[PDB]
Design a protein around this motif. Sequence first.
Motif, mmCIF file in Angstrom:
data_model
loop_
_atom_site.group_PDB
_atom_site.id
_atom_site.type_symbol
_atom_site.label_atom_id
_atom_site.label_comp_id
_atom_site.label_asym_id
_atom_site.label_seq_id
_atom_site.Cartn_x
_atom_site.Cartn_y
_atom_site.Cartn_z
ATOM 1 N N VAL A 235 76.140 99.201 21.786
ATOM 2 C CA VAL A 235 76.965 98.306 20.585
ATOM 3 C C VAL A 235 77.837 97.487 21.136
ATOM 4 C CG1 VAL A 235 78.016 98.634 18.462
ATOM 5 C CG2 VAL A 235 76.877 100.398 19.442
ATOM 6 N N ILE A 236 77.629 95.992 20.799
ATOM 7 C CA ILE A 236 78.517 95.222 21.488
ATOM 8 C C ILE A 236 79.567 94.876 20.194
ATOM 9 C CG2 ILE A 236 78.796 92.610 21.994
ATOM 10 C CD1 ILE A 236 77.323 94.525 23.926
ATOM 11 N N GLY A 237 80.838 94.465 20.595
ATOM 12 C CA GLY A 237 82.006 94.264 19.650
ATOM 13 C C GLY A 237 82.129 95.556 18.749
ATOM 14 N N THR B 79 75.098 93.445 7.264
ATOM 15 C CA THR B 79 73.696 93.958 7.561
ATOM 16 C C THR B 79 73.480 93.480 9.141
ATOM 17 O OG1 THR B 79 72.606 94.008 5.466
ATOM 18 C CG2 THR B 79 71.428 93.723 7.494
ATOM 19 N N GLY B 80 72.956 94.511 9.887
ATOM 20 C CA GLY B 80 72.877 93.929 11.452
ATOM 21 C C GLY B 80 73.908 94.133 12.245
ATOM 22 N N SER B 81 75.015 94.789 11.909
ATOM 23 C CA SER B 81 76.276 94.705 12.722
ATOM 24 C C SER B 81 76.313 96.171 13.729
ATOM 25 C CB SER B 81 77.580 94.682 12.009
ATOM 26 O OG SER B 81 77.530 95.418 10.727
ATOM 27 N N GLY B 82 75.530 96.685 13.542
ATOM 28 C CA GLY B 82 75.444 98.097 14.540
ATOM 29 C C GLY B 82 76.166 99.204 13.696
ATOM 30 N N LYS B 83 76.125 99.439 12.422
ATOM 31 C CA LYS B 83 76.404 100.669 11.430
ATOM 32 C C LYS B 83 75.542 101.729 11.938
ATOM 33 C CE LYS B 83 76.178 98.425 7.579
ATOM 34 N NZ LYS B 83 75.766 97.044 8.250
ATOM 35 N N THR B 84 73.893 101.777 11.511
ATOM 36 C CA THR B 84 73.250 102.770 11.843
ATOM 37 C C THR B 84 73.020 103.041 13.336
ATOM 38 O OG1 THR B 84 71.157 102.761 12.035
ATOM 39 C CG2 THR B 84 71.925 101.585 10.127
ATOM 40 N N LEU B 85 73.342 101.869 13.868
ATOM 41 C CA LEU B 85 73.263 101.947 15.561
ATOM 42 C C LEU B 85 74.286 102.851 16.020
ATOM 43 C CD1 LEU B 85 71.840 101.052 18.092
ATOM 44 C CD2 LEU B 85 73.425 99.007 18.186
#
Length: 327
Positions: free
Chosen positions: A19-21, A77-83
């Motif tokens: 995860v970046i940022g 959406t697409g920020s790394g949450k479920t990631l």
Amino acid sequence: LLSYIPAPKELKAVLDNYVIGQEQAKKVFSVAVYNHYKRLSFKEKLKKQDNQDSNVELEHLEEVELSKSNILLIGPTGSGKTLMAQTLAKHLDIPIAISDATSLTVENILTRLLQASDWNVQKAQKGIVFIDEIDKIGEGVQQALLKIVEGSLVNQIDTSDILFICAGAFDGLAEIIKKRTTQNVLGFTQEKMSKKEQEAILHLVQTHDLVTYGLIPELIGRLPVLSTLDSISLEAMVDILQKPKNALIKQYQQLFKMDEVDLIFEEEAIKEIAQLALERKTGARGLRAIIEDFCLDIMFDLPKLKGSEVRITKDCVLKQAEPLIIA
Ligand SMILES: Nc1ncnc2c1ncn2[C@@H]1O[C@H](COP(=O)(O)OP(=O)(O)O)[C@@H](O)[C@H]1O
């Protein structure tokens, strides 16, 4: 494995490799996943220990009532949450089941978890339940969910020690924390907040905010940990393409290397790929699709390139030119 819970810094390290940022969210998630598992482990230690000393501690730990640290992730959406969740669940080798708040315009959820842990009640009860888009809800779904988050018996599964993680964009929340909220403004404001601040104000959200948004105080209380993620900026997107351990570029270089070709993405090429993902609002999810679109032809006739160097450029990316093959 409740034998060793790597430290928050270790977990955060794993997180950093994918995860970046999202430095704060990473920090908050690490400490939260650690406290949750340190407790289940600590609690399990005493029981096995089975004696009077360890038995008093168990009672005090119960008496003090250490609220379960279910997490609430808030971010575009697409920020790394479920990631983030997926990353650690894979590291600790913990079964995790992702679901969708919309699915409930049920016990079904705990069913996947079982399937995700070999129907082993124990591992399932030490697993994670990911509820995405908790923000899409109606007032009924919440309570129907609350029973399980709060912890109950279902048929059989005990959801008391299951770590719950809810996520969503809460598109509305932005304004709410900019109306009847602290750090107000007395001066002349020129216009609606820019999504930059409309996403930076979130980092100043409090429980009363989730309520106004339409979240029953009963559930919010069950999500002690709130974490906010930024939107992927151009620079971060540029990093996502090359920095992570499983970065797309390294995948493509690995794949081209097997045919003895050195694949290189020139800087402005990466910048162009990243800038595209943003425009098309296809986000980080759309990076592979953008690369495939100008790499398909290249991979198709890769052999007449064997032993050489293939240099990807902005033009090539924009499909306005061929790649730079270099002897
Ligand atoms: N911060 C990030 N760092 C690296 N990759 C990311 C990041 N955010 C999103 N991605 C990529 O885009 C996908 C979207 O992931 P996800 O975090 O699950 O979405 P959401 O934040 O909406 O829940 C990821 O699986 C990953 O490949």
